[PDB]
Symmetry: D2
Subunit: 364 residues, 4 copies
């Protein structure tokens, strides 16, 4: 930990101890029951894990993005579903309100988002850019449409919902929708291969009317807003891939050392060497992008490179962790099978690998 | 199909029909409930799938190994757990009895294995880290077995197990013997099925032998021949798992390519995107190569030629490929690929075991290298 | 071998002897001099390797395509450059004349192509146009009873040694994809100007030449097929071409692997033959497995083609797979050799250099993928 | 660059200018002739490139190891052979004398090594730790006999750090290190080896036949030879990591420019998704390789343990370089296989990085050992 700053090493310690004491012993159960207890979410709130990229005067704990990634790496090593909840809540639950909310808006919502009292959700994508619509009639914005894969959909108190307001690029607007609003209809959580305890829900909007002052930004600023947190999001998920890969690697190398022991059979040792090299490269790409972002510099390509690299790495590293365990690797009680299922999603959400490659290439 | 013989196409069509009518629509449920219905196993019996490498003379359906491979690829595309059952039963349930059994032993057990009335299992490996701790002592005209075995596929539904034990500890490599143990023999204790990431409906159980006393005539082959017997269906087992890996990959590939033709993003079917197209071509290439390696091994095996390397190449290749094709199949589905209801996530989970069992990839590589 | 037919074993035996006696011992020198002696090309002629896909009654030696792939793999295992020459001459030198030639045109040319008295070249690619092979700027105009070719061509294999070239030219510039025509052009024709062979990383003894056509006049009866049929003709030997390159990749890789496995048995490090080191043994096992899959893809495409069945996909899969496999196999061979792997005298560096072209010519990997995907 | 330091940016900018004006225009010709012009070596010396990990007090230009890695990357991108010479000279030419030499020894040789006046070589391995080359103390001199293998800079070096058995029966603690002037009678340098790549980096066998040197040329203590042989592994590996990053980067830069110029089916080929995907993968792996390499250098700069980290950088960069060079070939199509388009030289040069300064297999052993 010698190369990190003092802020960064403090977050790392706090994160480490939380993860060892609360996440790691319970993640198997949470996966098996597809459910993360709310008191664990609340406790993440109290510790500042749900406002790590909100400034401290708005109720958060932001220091820099390297710290953020270190915390999300630790949290993902303990529980990949927690890391999903946290990466989404901080980046796209908190980000839009902080960056485009008026002062009154931030007073209404941001301190509760940043403290974790209110969990946040972001809803842009749709089953088939958009067909969800919002009409302004009699002082209320009225939303009708259908939305897909909303992380934190069941538990969020607020949702940033994107909707077509003016059908002729600047045709979308963003809304803060409290999730108890009549006509905000959240469906049953999707059944997923992995991150099973991170609730991922479809949402139907059926004349969901919200006050006019719940418009977020100016009318027509929807797309820009939806795109304002790609760097933070991708950095977050790259950090998550790194943590999940690292957890499986930690188990593999512990199993190799105990099962001479198999860690000095050439082939096993080569896998472990490869796994360590790849995990460390993923971390360094993640941190490099986080430094640029901390400094306010352009870093979409760098963040997309981290997310790309870390995500693909993680599936291969988790696959080696299984292989190193033999027959036991396929068994639930040995946990690496969980890490393998959890890892897979990182290549898909927050921009697919194909999208990550498009943007990196665009800028060469 | 016009590339295959008459017999082969017939076995292929019979299995296609069974997988479409019975397996494919119910796989998802069986994965969900971690259980294959006894009657579906009995129906594979009735159809000859549980005797495909047993001569017709002994009640089986043997034509050749390519045909075996074709049937297993089809079963696997519909239900990976079914393929596991079928492949283990046929190769290591039926094989030891067929090759090493006396005539009377073949009459007492082989007809029922081949018909599928008796499901067979095979138990050599043990849960500690050749050098077995499980023992057999000859006492008053009976073999008495004491031991603990690990991961017996078909462990719960098998009526017979081939069970290997130390009979002569001084003799080392010739220290082992093989025994046919009816699973209802007192002292044959089946534990709870293991909880696995995939092939969840294939029962995999630890077993203990506790003063498990069996008739002297249940010794399979000669005393001390157990190792040799334990190693004599490696070719067949490995051919079948390579076929299974091929079928699993093919199911996910078929779902993904159909999805890529129907799904529209950026104003064209996604199969018209170059990156997607490249995955689809790589998938088809790798599946075809895996099938070609498998059938080449099968062809050598059918002609009684030595083929342990060719069988191991095919199993190594098909197993590694199946993970990469299934991963690609998930990716082409985007977020839907991660969803249970889109099924490719089941194919991925199921395929991962193929690199491990029937000899790990590491073991496969060792034999292939040994002959180079 | 037991799985092959008597014709297949016969050609296989013949190629093997030739490759040990003539090719393998001299290949290093030819790479070094960037030159294949004419007497070696004549011997391949005499032995029937330049007619392996022309029927016997036209002077060829065609039995089936599996035989062809076996012969090409051997030839390639001894000299990659030689395999390039053979593959091109057979598929696109002979093929166009065989398939589209009149009786008179086959009597004039195909017996000499099939015996190897005359080496064949194929010229389509231009400086601006490779993978997009239809937009041609080379032109052909009828004046005074002769076809007059003017233009510029690129990367012609066998370009300096060939006696005939199948040249593709725009006869009808406003007719697009139906505007190409194919022409048999004697390479001694005035205005058929062969540039100096390209300097390449690998297959350095396979002459690969630019060609300038300048008031290059030929008899009217050197038109091959119907006017406008050029594109169809240019695309009519894809399967055979790709089968042969797949077999070439397989043979180059095999040669690298044979050296590596022998060296790993002999070389000792940390008290045993490095072959017994598990990481080495794994590399060896992966190399065998991949070469074997390549071969089986190639022979499967060869069977469909022998039966006249459609097989462009299967041929493209073999080519893609073999070519990419060969790079990784030759790379493993280098690594198994340690620091000796980088040295010219240890040969495997040459196989690595030679292997790399197989992913590019006879349709790039990207093109192979497009056609495999399209036919799903 | 914003993220580098004033010294880092300083050495980077100088390496850039110099790669661009001297190295990159002439690298093809040097590869073709298998020869680096002496005056170019002298310019590297003069510019401080041959003293980059020796302190300023001893005639060097040492700032930190991140600066070293940046400069090696740039040199490598203009001329892989020059980078091989530079990496070796700094790491194992200067390193032993710097760290194990007496003050008298450092005054005698280290300043000339650091200024580039004298180029240094290092000679441990033989054709077959268990070594045949012997040194015998006789009449106030060490007399060396043996055969040595693949000495980089073997034909231009003025001094060679040679390792020999002083005490055959003490095994690993029976080796000693010696500073040998290369003009010493009985120091016979054979013909440079014929190689696939880095052809202008001279790589020579050396025969020592009754090669007699002063008693005071023992380096470190008698028996300390293996420890000295292993004392610059970190530096060496960081250097080759930077080499591999640079070679790949050169091929990458050519391929990405080509892709924006070459049109096929109506658009620049960089806009075909399959090419874009290659370019994106090349950029990402190259950056990953630099970041591993700089991470290692930071640990080295701070004097912290970093053998594994440098081994990870060297392993990752070297394997990466082959794959990136291969893509660069592919992106060029047929042109990629032609000498005039340069990417085929980069691919050839890149392949050595997986083998020397320890094979991939050796890198992976040290990484594993330490987990
Ligand atoms: C040694 C040797 C020998 C021969 C030949 C080449 C060489 C190097 N060829 C020519 C060969 O067929 C040619 O190199 C390929 O068609 C590739 O074309 P270019 O080199 O013009 O690359 P080109 O400019 O077409 O492509 C550059 C890169 O972009 C990619 N690309 C192009 N279009 C694309 C698309 N739509 N989507 C995705 N990617 C795309 C390609 O795959 C390639 O990777 C030939 N020719 C001949 O007529 N007669 C002969 O005998 C020979 N022999």
């Amino acid at each position: 930990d010698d190369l990190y700053t003092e802020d960064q090493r403090m977050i790392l310690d706090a994160a480490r101890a939380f993860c060892a004491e609360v996440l790691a012993p319970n993640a198997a159960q949470w996966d098996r029951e597809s459910h993360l207890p709310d008191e664990v979410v609340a406790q993440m709130g109290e510790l500042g894990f749900l406002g790590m990229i909100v400034p401290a005067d708005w109720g958060g704990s932001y220091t820099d993005y390297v710290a953020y990634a270190l915390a999300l790496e630790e949290i993902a090593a303990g529980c990949a579903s927690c890391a999903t909840l946290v990466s989404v809540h901080n980046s796209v639950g908190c980000g839009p309100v902080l960056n485009y909310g008026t002062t009154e808006q931030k007073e209404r919502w941001l301190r509760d988002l940043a403290s974790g009292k209110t969990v946040g959700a972001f809803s842009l994508t749709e089953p088939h850019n958009l067909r969800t619509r919002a009409e302004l009639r009699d002082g209320k914005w009225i939303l009708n449409g259908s939305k897909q894969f909303v992380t934190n959909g069941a538990r969020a108190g607020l949702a940033i919902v994107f909707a077509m307001t003016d059908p002729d690029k600047r045709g979308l607007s963003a809304f803060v929708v409290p999730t108890d609003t009549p006509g905000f209809i959240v469906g049953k959580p999707e059944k997923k291969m992995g991150i099973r305890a991170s609730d991922t829900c479809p949402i139907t909007l059926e004349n969901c009317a919200i006050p006019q002052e719940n418009l977020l930004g100016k009318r027509g600023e929807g797309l820009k807003i939806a795109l304002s947190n790609l760097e933070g999001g991708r950095i977050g998920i790259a950090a998550q891939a790194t943590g999940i890969a690292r957890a499986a690697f930690d188990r593999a190398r512990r199993y190799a050392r105990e099962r001479k022991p198999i860690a000095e059979h050439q082939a096993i040792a080569e896998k472990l060497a490869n796994m360590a090299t790849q995990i460390n490269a993923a971390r360094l790409l993640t941190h490099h992008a986080a430094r640029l972002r901390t400094a306010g510099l352009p870093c979409l390509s760098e963040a997309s490179q981290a997310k790309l690299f870390a995500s693909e790495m993680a599936e291969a590293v988790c696959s080696d962790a299984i292989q190193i365990h033999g027959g036991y690797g396929f068994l639930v009680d040995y946990e690496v099978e969980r890490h393998y299922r959890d890892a897979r999603i990182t290549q898909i959400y927050e921009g697919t690998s194909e999208v990550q490659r498009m943007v990196i290439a665009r800028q060469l």
